[PDB]
Design a protein around this ligand. Structure first.
Ligand SMILES: Cc1cc2nc3c(=O)[nH]c(=O)nc-3n(C[C@H](O)[C@H](O)[C@H](O)COP(=O)(O)O)c2cc1C
Length: 169
């Protein structure tokens, strides 16, 4: 009815499109979408299950709107919440900072108490470095519409089935 809050930020809409797919994969009224460009850090307190969507830009930078909300995280609490992350990036043009955005967001949110779920395998990706890594895996679903648009849909399906399990749905 109302359990998972998906807060996303997007520059050219790729991340938003993925967010809508994620929503449809979860089932009737489970997930609600929220453009962080119109959100206050306190909106995240209304959910015990969160999905953070954010593309990486300008070589390792958080998407514009997320950058603004990011600064307010240090004053909020995420303890007791399960948080998953996903983002669009470009492993070819920016192999050294692939998906840094979700890595940055995850570090901060986990630091504030959020427990991360939804770890994703790096197998099948071609990149050099990322701030979104932990124990050999991405801290969230890594999508690449610029180079692997053909893999996004099945990657989302797999990830949602994984989260349905990890969220205990
Ligand atoms: C100037 C510029 C810088 C970019 N930098 C990065 C980067 O550092 N890391 C990454 O993974 N992708 C990077 N990208 C690729 C975007 O993340 C990718 O195209 C993404 O799908 C955009 O999603 P959005 O439309 O949701 O903003 C960059 C793209 C441009 C045009």
């Amino acid at each position: 009815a109302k359990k998972i809050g998906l807060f996303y930020g997007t520059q050219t809409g790729k991340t938003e499109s993925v967010a809508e797919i994620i929503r449809d994969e979860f089932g009737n009224d489970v997930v609600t979408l929220h453009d962080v460009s119109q959100a206050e850090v306190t909106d995240l307190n209304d959910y015990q299950y969160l999905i953070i969507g954010c593309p990486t830009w300008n070589i390792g930078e958080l998407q514009s709107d997320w950058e603004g909300l990011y600064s307010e995280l240090d004053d909020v609490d995420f303890n007791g919440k399960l948080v998953a992350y996903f983002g669009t990036g470009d492993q070819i043009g920016f192999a050294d900072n692939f998906q840094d955005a979700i890595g940055i967001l995850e570090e901060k949110i986990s630091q504030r108490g959020g427990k991360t779920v939804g770890y994703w395998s790096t197998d099948g990706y071609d990149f050099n470095d990322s701030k979104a890594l932990r124990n050999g895996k991405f801290v969230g679903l890594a999508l690449d519409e610029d180079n692997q648009s053909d893999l996004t849909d099945d990657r989302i399906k797999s990830w949602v089935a994984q989260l349905k399990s990890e969220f205990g749905l």
